[PDB]
Design an enzyme around this catalytic site. Structure first.
Site, mmCIF file in Angstrom:
data_model
loop_
_atom_site.group_PDB
_atom_site.id
_atom_site.type_symbol
_atom_site.label_atom_id
_atom_site.label_comp_id
_atom_site.label_asym_id
_atom_site.label_seq_id
_atom_site.Cartn_x
_atom_site.Cartn_y
_atom_site.Cartn_z
ATOM 1 N N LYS A 1 0.707 -1.388 0.053
ATOM 2 C CA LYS A 1 0.173 -0.106 0.135
ATOM 3 C C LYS A 1 0.739 1.747 -0.065
ATOM 4 O O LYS A 1 0.137 1.994 -0.233
ATOM 5 C CB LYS A 1 -0.838 -0.021 0.809
ATOM 6 C CG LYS A 1 -1.719 -0.909 1.121
ATOM 7 C CD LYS A 1 -2.530 -1.004 -0.437
ATOM 8 C CE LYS A 1 -4.379 -2.012 -0.423
ATOM 9 N NZ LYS A 1 -4.218 -2.800 0.630
ATOM 10 N N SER B 1 -2.332 -12.946 2.556
ATOM 11 C CA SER B 1 -3.080 -12.640 1.343
ATOM 12 C C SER B 1 -1.316 -13.074 0.311
ATOM 13 O O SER B 1 -2.151 -13.583 -0.902
ATOM 14 C CB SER B 1 -3.169 -11.632 0.943
ATOM 15 O OG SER B 1 -1.989 -10.692 0.744
HETATM 16 C C1 LIG Z 1 -3.570 -4.019 -0.131
HETATM 17 C C2 LIG Z 1 -3.423 -5.362 0.127
HETATM 18 C C3 LIG Z 1 -3.964 -6.993 -1.303
HETATM 19 C C4 LIG Z 1 -4.323 -6.537 -2.153
HETATM 20 O O1 LIG Z 1 -4.160 -5.447 -3.156
HETATM 21 P P1 LIG Z 1 -5.046 -4.244 -4.285
HETATM 22 O O2 LIG Z 1 -3.767 -3.399 -4.888
HETATM 23 O O3 LIG Z 1 -5.450 -2.876 -3.190
HETATM 24 O O4 LIG Z 1 -6.510 -5.351 -4.641
HETATM 25 C C5 LIG Z 1 -3.727 -7.672 -0.370
HETATM 26 N N1 LIG Z 1 -3.338 -7.990 0.497
HETATM 27 C C6 LIG Z 1 -2.263 -7.237 1.214
HETATM 28 C C7 LIG Z 1 -2.491 -7.403 2.994
HETATM 29 C C8 LIG Z 1 -2.983 -5.879 0.689
HETATM 30 O O5 LIG Z 1 -2.988 -4.382 2.154
#
Ligand SMILES: *Cc1c(COP(=O)(O)O)cnc(C)c1O
Ligand SMILES: *Cc1c(COP(=O)(O)O)cnc(C)c1O
Lengths: 294, 294
Positions: free
Chosen positions: A41, A255
């Site tokens: 981010k 993620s």
């Molecule tokens: C933001 C984020 C994502 C997704 O990325 P995007 O560009 O918002 O689609 C995935 N995993 C984590 C931990 C994130 O902070």
């Protein structure tokens, strides 16, 4: 490298050495935890603020507002501290206390809505504040400067780092900024590059990934930029995350485990593929949630 | 960048923009939190294992043992996972549970001694294990491959990154590997570079920094490599750490606040100096200790 701003992006691209299938494919990990505040981010957060500055909208000392449920708050708290802004973050009241502390350490002001009010309620309150003159809403799900970060930095870097050899790009989708910006860049290349988005299976909870209903996909999202969507089971994301740490020395969030789970399926399907997956963050802020226990 | 090993070192060097004195001096921060496991210890940990490999001492699958009271355990857990070793870490029982979880996430085995047994007791137990055939002791306080990391990587990088303009190098001293290796490199340059070591004031507790009695300085330490030693008060280190996050967007640990506190005194004393200070780690593992509260 002049200042901290120049340390955002240009993150490493490293190959899996033990966990890939043995079919000639390669899986390369783009290490977005290397950003100063530890997640992908930082790119969108920097870009939203830099482009607003370029448009004459904000000047150091001004107040910025965002509704956040995860890493965006930390990234924006950091950029605001770096660039001299006052940051106000609205969040649902299931945000962990550790993550609240992470944002507060940079000097941000935090404001709760209830879990039932949610992100929608958090955005509505942010608009109401903006209308009272209490700050400028960044609006990460709708702000074009989120995917623009990835169009101008993440995508070009991956292309350069792979020497144009990338065949597939894999991203766990949240705001969709990453996949959208990278796809836009990759589509401009002569070589075809397959764009793979990941979502959780119905009923799976994977921090940072959303299973968007078709009707409620984010403003910035363009379905035509994504070639395939694969579903990830929560347990598979968590197991793969744990495996990354033990087998590869790569310590990342849930993620990111999901992104590698998906990339391994892409790589297994497509012999001799060169698959690049986004590792979204470091594992540090996940330890207290218990998810690194077997 | 081929693999994760190539992401150790070559960390950013960034300038303070708001916190320096206004006397023409510059204070530059070497961001060792950018190492994969989040601290400067990744350099010594990599070097101890790579040089042992080069000497034919160890092969993947072998057991490594270290006594640790801080970041060295995390760094070694990561390198062992990366390179395919089995890691055993002995620590006093005041190691935080969060830091134990950080080491365990990489697959390391942890073993306690009591606080009263301490690091000495932890090293003794490690020798006893080594003698039973239960693993190879790394011995960070005595192992030359700790400062050698800094002689061959940290020092050369700082020289290159400053274009030879560095006038002062500031390091919070723990093992003394960083200051010792960097000083050895800097002494080889034609230009004089002043080497500033930091220790806590008597009665101050600053995680990662030691106030060594003259008689119990680490095996690797050479007093002649250090030009001046400055004392840092615990509260000054903590206040400066908090200030870094809020005023600069730099989120680091207590000893890093101490390093910048010291560098600011060096910079204030010496107009037009170019002062480089080591930022030892990111702040993430400190939030749960409460030290980021005012
Ligand atoms: C933001 C984020 C994502 C997704 O990325 P995007 O560009 O918002 O689609 C995935 N995993 C984590 C931990 C994130 O902070
Ligand atoms: C190791 C460490 C130090 C000291 O560095 P040495 O090279 O061991 O002198 C300072 N602070 C922290 C947080 C450390 O982990």
């Amino acid at each position: 490298m002049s200042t901290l701003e120049q340390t955002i992006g240009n993150t490493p691209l490293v190959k899996l050495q033990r966990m890939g299938p043995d079919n000639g494919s390669e899986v390369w990990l783009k290490l977005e935890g290397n950003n100063p505040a530890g997640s992908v981010k930082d790119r969108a957060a920097l870009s939203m603020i830099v482009e607003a500055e370029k448009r004459g909208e904000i000047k150091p000392g001004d107040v910025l507002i965002e509704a956040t449920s995860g890493n965006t708050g930390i990234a924006l708290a950091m950029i605001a501290a770096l660039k001299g802004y006052r940051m106000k973050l609205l969040m649902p009241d299931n945000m962990s206390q550790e993550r609240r502390a992470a944002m507060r350490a940079y000097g941000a002001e935090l404001i709760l809505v209830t879990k039932e009010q949610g992100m929608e309620g958090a955005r509505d309150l942010a608009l109401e504040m903006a209308n009272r003159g209490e700050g400028k809403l960044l609006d990460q799900f709708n702000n074009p400067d989120n995917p623009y970060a990835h169009y101008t930095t993440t995508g070009p870097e991956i292309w350069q780092q792979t020497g144009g050899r990338i065949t597939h790009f894999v991203s766990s989708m949240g705001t969709t900024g990453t996949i959208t910006g990278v796809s836009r860049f990759m589509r401009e290349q002569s070589k075809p590059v397959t764009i793979v988005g990941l979502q959780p299976e119905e009923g799976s909870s994977i921090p940072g990934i959303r299973r968007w209903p078709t009707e409620y996909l984010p403003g910035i999202f363009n379905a035509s930029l994504v070639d395939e969507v694969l579903d990830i089971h929560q347990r598979d994301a968590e197991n793969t995350m744990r495996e990354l740490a033990v087998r590869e020395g790569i310590f990342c969030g849930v993620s990111s485990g999901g992104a590698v789970a998906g990339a391994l399926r892409v790589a297994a399907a497509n012999p001799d593929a060169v698959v690049v997956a986004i590792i979204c963050d470091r594992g540090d802020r996940y330890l207290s949630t218990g998810v690194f226990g077997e």
